[PDB]
Amino acid sequence: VWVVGMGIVMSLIVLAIVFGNVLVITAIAKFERLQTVTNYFITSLACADLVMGLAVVPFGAAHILTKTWTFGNFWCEFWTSIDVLCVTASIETLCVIAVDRYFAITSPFKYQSLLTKNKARVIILMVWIVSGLTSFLPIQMHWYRATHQEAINCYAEETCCDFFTNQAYAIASSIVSFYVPLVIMVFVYSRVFQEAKRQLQKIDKSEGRHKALKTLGIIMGTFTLCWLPFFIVNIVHVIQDNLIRKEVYILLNWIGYVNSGFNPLIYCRSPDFRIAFQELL
Numbered sequence: 001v002w003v004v005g006m007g008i009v010m011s012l013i014v015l016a017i018v019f020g021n022v023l024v025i026t027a028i029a030k031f032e033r034l035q036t037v038t039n040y041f042i043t044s045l046a047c048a049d050l051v052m053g054l055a056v057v058p059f060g061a062a063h064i065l066t067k068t069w070t071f072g073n074f075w076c077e078f079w080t081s082i083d084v085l086c087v088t089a090s091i092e093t094l095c096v097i098a099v100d101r102y103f104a105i106t107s108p109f110k111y112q113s114l115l116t117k118n119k120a121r122v123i124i125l126m127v128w129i130v131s132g133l134t135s136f137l138p139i140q141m142h143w144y145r146a147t148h149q150e151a152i153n154c155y156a157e158e159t160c161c162d163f164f165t166n167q168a169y170a171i172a173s174s175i176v177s178f179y180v181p182l183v184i185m186v187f188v189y190s191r192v193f194q195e196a197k198r199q200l201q202k203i204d205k206s207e208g209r210h211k212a213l214k215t216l217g218i219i220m221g222t223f224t225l226c227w228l229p230f231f232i233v234n235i236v237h238v239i240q241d242n243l244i245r246k247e248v249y250i251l252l253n254w255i256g257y258v259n260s261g262f263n264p265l266i267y268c269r270s271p272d273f274r275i276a277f278q279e280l281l
């Protein structure tokens, strides 16, 4: 008397993700005044989130609802690889946007020389290649498998599918995809906030007669809350196997997926975006 209800929530999640990503992509694509060298990163992030919502979630619903991966054996590895690829691509695009903002604020005169139209394509291709190198290559030819007695049946059985790995790939992927972007973003945003506070203090010297922290807080806190616990538990369960059950792992992995749907609600609030959105509908 509970299976039917959760399907509604999952369908709403899918619909929200798809609608948001499609709306953002259409808005930036159709209207000329919105395209910008900085705005292409938003397009890449929206494309990655749309791919995640279209592929990962609808297929992942089978495990939750039917409790039986009735699909073929070859499909599960592809599904896992595309999921990890989408996650790492989204995280790296977020880090790239943060670095772009740091460069913009820190040096205005040198900003034009550093970044041009052709640079965006090169950097996005490089980041997508480095994101996909760690997803498809180590998974397709079975570098990630474990010699432990458990999951030998899982690879052997046709009806079973769950994520078990050896003690190299989990830690390598966690280091590549989570800790470095967090360090980079924390450093650049701390410097940006310090510069903004310095300017705000300087204004009051010439105006002889902080509410700007909210934007930084909303940018940092939602991402940290969404993604921090998952990689901590991912690191911890591998080193010692009996600490973490499967249900907690699945719940954290699922709550980590909702983050991609909230990026349009946080990263496109400019008046030009709102005007385009109003004009579309």
Ligand SMILES: CN[C@@H]1CCc2c(ccc(O)c2O)[C@H]1O
Residues within 6 Å of the ligand: 080, 083, 084, 087, 088, 163, 169, 170, 173, 174, 177, 253
């Ligand atoms: C089964 N779900 C996967 C499992 C491991 C993993 C994920 C995402 C990014 C990574 O770097 C990972 O190593 C998860 O989405």
